[PDB]
Amino acid sequence: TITDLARENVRNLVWLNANEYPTAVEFQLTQQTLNRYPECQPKAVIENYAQYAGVKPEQVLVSRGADEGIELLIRAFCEPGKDAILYCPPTYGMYSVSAETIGVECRTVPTLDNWQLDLQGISDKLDGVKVVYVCSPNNPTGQLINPQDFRTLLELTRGKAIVVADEAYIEFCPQASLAGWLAEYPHLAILRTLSKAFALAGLRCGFTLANEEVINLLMKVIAPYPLSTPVADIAAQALSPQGIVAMRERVAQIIAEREYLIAALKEIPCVEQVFDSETNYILARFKASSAVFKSLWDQGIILRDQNKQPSLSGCLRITVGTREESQRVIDAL
Amino acid sequence: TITDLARENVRNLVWLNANEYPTAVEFQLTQQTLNRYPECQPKAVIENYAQYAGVKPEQVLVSRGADEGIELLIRAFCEPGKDAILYCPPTYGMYSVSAETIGVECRTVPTLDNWQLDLQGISDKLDGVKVVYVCSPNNPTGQLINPQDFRTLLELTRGKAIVVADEAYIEFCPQASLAGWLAEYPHLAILRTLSKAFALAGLRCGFTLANEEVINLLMKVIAPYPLSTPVADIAAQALSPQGIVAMRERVAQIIAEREYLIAALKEIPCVEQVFDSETNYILARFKASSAVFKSLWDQGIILRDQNKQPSLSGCLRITVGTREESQRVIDAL
Numbered sequence A, B: 001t002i003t004d005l006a007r008e009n010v011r012n013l014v015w016l017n018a019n020e021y022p023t024a025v026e027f028q029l030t031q032q033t034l035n036r037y038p039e040c041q042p043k044a045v046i047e048n049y050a051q052y053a054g055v056k057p058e059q060v061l062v063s064r065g066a067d068e069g070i071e072l073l074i075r076a077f078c079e080p081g082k083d084a085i086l087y088c089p090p091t092y093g094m095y096s097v098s099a100e101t102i103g104v105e106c107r108t109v110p111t112l113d114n115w116q117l118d119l120q121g122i123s124d125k126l127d128g129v130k131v132v133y134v135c136s137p138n139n140p141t142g143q144l145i146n147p148q149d150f151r152t153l154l155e156l157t158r159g160k161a162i163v164v165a166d167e168a169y170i171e172f173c174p175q176a177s178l179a180g181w182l183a184e185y186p187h188l189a190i191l192r193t194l195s196k197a198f199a200l201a202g203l204r205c206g207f208t209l210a211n212e213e214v215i216n217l218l219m220k221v222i223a224p225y226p227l228s229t230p231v232a233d234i235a236a237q238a239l240s241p242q243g244i245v246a247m248r249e250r251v252a253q254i255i256a257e258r259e260y261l262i263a264a265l266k267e268i269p270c271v272e273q274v275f276d277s278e279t280n281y282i283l284a285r286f287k288a289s290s291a292v293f294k295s296l297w298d299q300g301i302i303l304r305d306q307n308k309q310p311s312l313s314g315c316l317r318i319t320v321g322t323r324e325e326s327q328r329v330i331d332a333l
């Protein structure tokens, strides 16, 4: 049959649940040139993003979301069946998914009790690893990785593996970005997106920030015209000075609402513990989380269960929405 | 250094030149929901395309162009370093590019003198091949593959490999589509696009038509949200009844202009031979093609050199544009 021909690995492969900005920001097309193929790397988007991130244009690569960026790094550096990828659970699921789909080995070193890196465990499992992913701030936990530890991770992998900092939520704590470290570390790569703070998840637009040599290797493995013209168009508009300003206003409004939500949740009986976050979502441990999860779910309040993630039993991840959405969750709880 | 960490294979990896519709067809967004992630396979687009192609909705897969479709088939069926892909030159370059990028072997059996398939050579090289690509009408030659030979190819691979018919130009000769053969062949897959006749190359929207079992395996290897909301939006509009009608009008206008261009070129001294085409481009052999190519190029008339393709020495591929664009080429020649 048909499935027997498939690769073995392939044969076995209120909305507050996806970390999206709660409100739609309107945009309209300005470039009616849809009959022609777009440029491989839209100049307007790349230059606007480089100014925003404070890096050189030659250190930026635009792709179909940060998700494509994760895949590209594996495609360029890992030899299937020979090389490995390393990540530290509980974290973003796409790292393992892309590697498993591609047929590359996954090495996992779970983080310590406070979600920080187990530097000793990592140094013991580096042999044969080509790419290390580290999400900071981490999804779903919400916290930043100590920069001192990132320095250690960078020293450990110097000339052995590429270290990828997933900064999908860096807009909520801009001061913590490692974008300024590129000059010191040739093997450091950073993933950025327009899907979260930028309120543009529907666009599927992301970026990889790395030194020119890395960017050039990634250009060799990326699809010929990765971005559509309508996406490049809207993206350049959102990356304009006025757009960066409107973005910052969105972040500020989300942080204020996040602080209200944390304060209120800490007063609710069933809520055992609320963890600090530097993002647009809150991880909280509940007494009988599955019961509470199904209850809200039936009420039409959709969260994200994390009960099955390593060390997250009892936890649910709540995305920060509007004041009215927060009130619905509080009242419901 | 950084490159030493890259995979070996990766380390070594008037506009009438890209087969685009000459005129821009205008479209505007109707869905302002950009803050939320899009559905994995937009229902409107898939149902509209299924009605258009006359297939079941469960036999359609939408991707970032037919180019992504080519990649998906290799990712689902070919084991890197073990399985092979087979194509017949001179043809579309992306087949080999995707395989080489992924690390899968390429087996080539050039076509016969009339560009038809060498069935005996193919049957001799099938061992270890999982996917066979066949472009019909062929790019850059312009002709259709004899359906009798496709039947033979389908029998040869029955239960051994997937046969992919690249129908990127099928809108110019709708009667020749193999979309109706799906019921008889479980291993047949078809690639379609909105980049050529549909005048929407800037959208990066393509489709794969195959039996449900194949489609399901491809769903397992495709990126989670392959299509952006603005693309899904415009694509559903272009696939509406009125849009299919406007599309057909475009095809008719292109075919009439193509016939004029062929007639006129056959009268030009430097033009040694003009080959018949069932598409929106014309392959022609010239006396001193490089000299003619550079000359037009300096004049601002951009064609596509094919001089280096197997059996195409002296040939240039001319995309059919507007009446004024055809006149510029004729006069220039």
Ligand SMILES: *Cc1c(COP(=O)(O)O)cnc(C)c1O
Binding pocket: A019, A064, A065, A066, A067, A068, A092, A135, A139, A166, A168, A192, A193, A194, A195, A196, A201, A204, A205, A206
């Ligand atoms: C949302 C997210 C991404 C990917 O974003 P896209 O640009 O939508 O692909 C990557 N990493 C983390 C941790 C995320 O939460």
Ligand SMILES: *Cc1c(COP(=O)(O)O)cnc(C)c1O
Binding pocket: B019, B064, B065, B066, B067, B068, B092, B135, B139, B166, B168, B192, B193, B194, B195, B196, B201, B204, B205, B206
């Ligand atoms: C244009 C073309 C494609 C790909 O089209 P997209 O939808 O733009 O990726 C595939 N095959 C052939 C032969 C083509 O000419």
